[model samples]
Target: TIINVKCTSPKQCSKPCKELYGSSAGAKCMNGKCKCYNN
Candidate 1:
């Protein structure tokens, strides 16, 4: 998930980030990279 991880939109990342990381996720393309904010 970390390798080649990039999101085009909010829809692209957050849901998968939640599944992959097993936590609540807020996702974004920060500096052209996908990052998850977990809570």
Candidate 2:
């Protein structure tokens, strides 16, 4: 699953995704939006 979070960089989204979904979760800046997913 992925969450719609706006972000300017992958780092911006990465932290919150990890925190919200756990250490294994990850995020990247996709077209200026955060695309977060679980591994």
Candidate 3:
């Protein structure tokens, strides 16, 4: 399952964090980009 979060970075993806895998995922603004965390 993928969970969508609020857009943190305006220069990376047009949206926010997009889960590419399991049930839970998170994103953070890193280096002026959105970094997705998977488990």
Candidate 4:
């Protein structure tokens, strides 16, 4: 399942997603939010 985290920039969400999911690539900046998916 994917997770949605409200974010302003890719940089803003990168850390959390990386820390949680293990890779910043797992999360992307979309529609002014961070769309996180399993890698």
Candidate 5:
């Protein structure tokens, strides 16, 4: 599973992240940026 996405906000990219990995998508916010990962 490598459906990681670079995002600005987890709240906004929640569905998109999930769709990318097909499910269990999570986001990490740090350093003024957001990174989505397949969890």
Candidate 6:
């Protein structure tokens, strides 16, 4: 299962990404900034 989170910008979502997805998750502002919860 993949969880997708929408953020205002990638920079803004980085913290959450690291916390939830881990350091491996490179949360960057791509098109709209999103975090992927890959299971």
Model 5 Cα lDDT, one tens digit per residue, 1-39: 223445556665675565566667765645445556867
**Alpha-carbon local distance difference test for all models:** 0.64, 0.79, 0.44, 0.69, 0.58, 0.61
Model 1, 1-39: lDDT tens per residue? 242366677667776677666767766665546776766
* Model 4 per-residue lDDT tens digits across residues 1-39: 345677778777776688787863567777767766666
* Model 4 error, position 24 (Å): 5.8
lDDT of 2 by residue, 1-39 (tens): 667777888988987798887877768788877777877
Every model: Cα RMSD to truth: 3.0, 1.5, 7.2, 2.4, 3.7, 3.9
* Candidate 1: stretches off by over 4 Å: 1-3
Error of 5 at 21 (Å): 0.7
Per-model TM-score on C-alpha atoms? 0.48, 0.65, 0.33, 0.51, 0.41, 0.43
Which residue pairs does candidate 2 place in steric collision?
Answer: none
lDDT of 3 by residue, 1-39 (tens): 233444447324334444253344455554455556653
Model 6's lDDT to the true fold? 0.61
- What tens-digit string does per-residue lDDT give for candidate 6 at 1-39? 223666777667776777777777766555654755433
Candidate of highest TM-score: 2
TM-score of 3: 0.33
Please give the clash total of every predicted structure, in order: 0, 0, 0, 0, 0, 0
**Model 5 stretches astray by more than 4 angstroms:** 1-9, 29-34
Model 3 residue 4 lDDT score: 42
Name the Cα RMSD for model 2: 1.5
Model 2: residues with Cα > 4 Å off, grouped in runs: none
Stretches off by above 4 angstroms in model 6 are 1-6, 28-33, 37-39
